[PDB]
Write an enzyme that holds these catalytic residues in place. Structure first.
Site, PDB file in Angstrom:
ATOM      1  N   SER A  58       0.865  -1.196   0.000  1.00 42.25           N
ATOM      2  CA  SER A  58       0.000   0.000   0.000  1.00 42.25           C
ATOM      3  C   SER A  58       0.895   1.237   0.000  1.00 42.25           C
ATOM      4  O   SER A  58       1.790   1.340  -0.852  1.00 42.25           O
ATOM      5  CB  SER A  58      -0.975  -0.095   1.161  1.00 42.25           C
TER       6      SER A  58
ATOM      7  N   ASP B 132      -7.421  -2.396  -7.617  1.00 40.25           N
ATOM      8  CA  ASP B 132      -7.049  -2.118  -6.238  1.00 40.25           C
ATOM      9  C   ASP B 132      -8.117  -1.276  -5.524  1.00 40.25           C
ATOM     10  O   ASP B 132      -8.580  -0.265  -6.052  1.00 40.25           O
ATOM     11  CB  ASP B 132      -5.701  -1.409  -6.230  1.00 40.25           C
TER      12      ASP B 132
ATOM     13  N   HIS C 274      -6.941  -5.491  -1.771  1.00 34.76           N
ATOM     14  CA  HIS C 274      -5.942  -4.511  -1.344  1.00 34.76           C
ATOM     15  C   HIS C 274      -4.898  -5.231  -0.505  1.00 34.76           C
ATOM     16  O   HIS C 274      -5.259  -5.890   0.468  1.00 34.76           O
ATOM     17  CB  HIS C 274      -6.583  -3.376  -0.528  1.00 34.76           C
TER      18      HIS C 274
HETATM   19  O1  LIG Z   1      -1.878   2.706   2.423  1.00 34.76           O
HETATM   20  C1  LIG Z   1      -2.997   2.339   1.976  1.00 34.76           C
HETATM   21  O2  LIG Z   1      -3.600   1.356   2.504  1.00 34.76           O
HETATM   22  C2  LIG Z   1      -3.609   3.100   0.805  1.00 34.76           C
HETATM   23  C3  LIG Z   1      -2.843   3.071  -0.525  1.00 34.76           C
HETATM   24  C4  LIG Z   1      -1.715   4.110  -0.569  1.00 34.76           C
HETATM   25  C5  LIG Z   1      -2.071   5.602  -0.717  1.00 34.76           C
HETATM   26  C6  LIG Z   1      -2.471   6.038  -2.132  1.00 34.76           C
HETATM   27  C7  LIG Z   1      -3.802   5.893  -2.479  1.00 34.76           C
HETATM   28  C8  LIG Z   1      -4.266   6.254  -3.745  1.00 34.76           C
HETATM   29  C9  LIG Z   1      -3.385   6.780  -4.683  1.00 34.76           C
HETATM   30  C10 LIG Z   1      -2.033   6.943  -4.351  1.00 34.76           C
HETATM   31  C11 LIG Z   1      -1.158   7.477  -5.313  1.00 34.76           C
HETATM   32  C12 LIG Z   1       0.189   7.624  -5.014  1.00 34.76           C
HETATM   33  C13 LIG Z   1       0.652   7.258  -3.757  1.00 34.76           C
HETATM   34  C14 LIG Z   1      -0.205   6.738  -2.797  1.00 34.76           C
HETATM   35  C15 LIG Z   1      -1.567   6.576  -3.092  1.00 34.76           C
END
Ligand SMILES: O=C(O)CCCCc1cccc2ccccc12
Ligand SMILES: *[C@@H]1O[C@H](CO)[C@@H](O)[C@H](O)[C@H]1NC(C)=O
Length: 343
Positions: free
Chosen positions: A145, A245, A289
């Protein structure tokens, strides 16, 4: 179980100034080292970092972290759960900087929070050399993530840090799980681009050098997007990405009629396209996810090959192989057209 060590250099901190750290489970005689970056979104201004401090404080502070963690999935030491690297030294780096692992800014009179993700990783790498990492052959920097995006932002800096520290024999590699996002148009408007542009400024976020030189000042947000930063990286990086995702769909305001159907099918096709020239990749057509620290990460398969197998085949290629593929991208166009998708 992995055991907590807080960083001896207490100037490298979580958001609230408490020391950052890592969980370690050493495996004597193995020269493989797996450093896993936890995920968990981010915050990009004072008001929403204040909110996160109220209800997600363990992602901003070490004050309440437990003394131990159980390694699961690729962090498991049991071959039954982790066919890939069960014998490796295991490191879990808690995400307590809310900066997608990009920050290098201390808490001060002018900053309510410290954003030091990029320095936390370097400091963990520094302090581990004295606990066996000096003898490593392979350091795999993995993450899920926001931690998967953190792999893309930091893997080449980990390699450069070890080169200038006198360890050119440690092979640094990356494994980015569910951190490969598209800066696409939302299904219903109002979005990652603006949140990251504000984050970078708010965090004093840093991106890999070559990517920074391509997009230049004011445009560093581009390097948070896998398909843009990845061709600039020198380290080998394996990319694991669900085609649909859940975090991608969330930021796209997707929660079925023709318009949404086409939007979802085009999203999956765009993601496949960005992966066409990524040689080591695992991308199943599932709505999900994260995967690599889930206990049942052995269950999903693409074209009949599991992720632990694809990773092992990647290991072999870094010494095509017969019956040992490394590029595994689903071609079917709708979530759960792959029957091994998680339920
Ligand atoms: O950490 C999690 O569970 C959520 C996923 C990471 C955060 C994120 C979400 C959506 C778009 C993103 C784009 C670039 C970096 C990060 C992005
Ligand atoms: C502690 O970490 C900070 C941030 O990287 C660095 O500036 C400083 O040199 C470090 N001190 C020691 C003793 O490692």
């Amino acid at each position: 179980d992995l055991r907590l060590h807080l960083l001896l250099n207490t100037s490298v901190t979580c958001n609230d100034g408490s020391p950052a750290g890592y969980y370690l489970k050493e495996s004597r005689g193995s020269r493989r080292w797996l450093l896993f970056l936890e995920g968990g979104w981010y915050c990009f201004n004072r008001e929403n970092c204040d909110s996160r401090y109220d209800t997600m404080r363990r992602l901003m502070s070490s004050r309440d972290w437990p003394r131990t963690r159980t390694g699961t999935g690729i962090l498991s030491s049991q071959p039954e759960e982790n066919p890939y690297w069960w014998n490796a030294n295991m490191v879990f780096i808690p995400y307590c900087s809310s900066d997608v692992w990009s920050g290098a800014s201390s808490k001060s009179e002018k900053n309510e929070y410290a954003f030091m993700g990029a320095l936390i990783i370097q400091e963990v790498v520094r302090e581990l050399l004295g606990r066996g990492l000096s003898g490593a052959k392979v350091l795999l920097l993995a993450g899920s993530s926001a931690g998967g995006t953190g792999v893309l932002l930091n893997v080449d800096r980990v390699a450069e840090q070890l080169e200038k520290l006198g360890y050119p024999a440690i092979q640094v590699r990356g494994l980015a799980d569910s951190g490969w996002f598209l800066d696409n148009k939302q299904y219903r408007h109002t979005a990652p681009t603006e949140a990251i542009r504000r984050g970078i400024r708010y965090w004093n976020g840093v991106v890999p050098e070559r990517c920074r030189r391509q997009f230049q000042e004011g445009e560093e947000w581009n390097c948070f997007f896998g398909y843009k930063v990845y061709p600039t990286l020198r380290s080998p990086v394996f990319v694991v990405q669900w085609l649909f995702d859940e975090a991608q769909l969330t930021v796209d305001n997707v929660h079925v009629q023709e318009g949404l159907r086409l939007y979802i099918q085009n999203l999956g096709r765009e993601l496949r396209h960005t992966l066409k020239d990524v040689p080591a990749s695992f991308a199943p057509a599932c709505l999900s996810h994260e995967i690599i620290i889930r206990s049942h990460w052995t269950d999903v398969q693409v074209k009949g090959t599991s992720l632990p197998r694809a990773l092992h085949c990647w290991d072999r290629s870094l010494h095509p192989l017969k019956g040992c593929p490394v590029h595994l991208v689903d071609s079917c166009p709708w979530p759960h057209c792959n029957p091994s998708c998680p339920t």
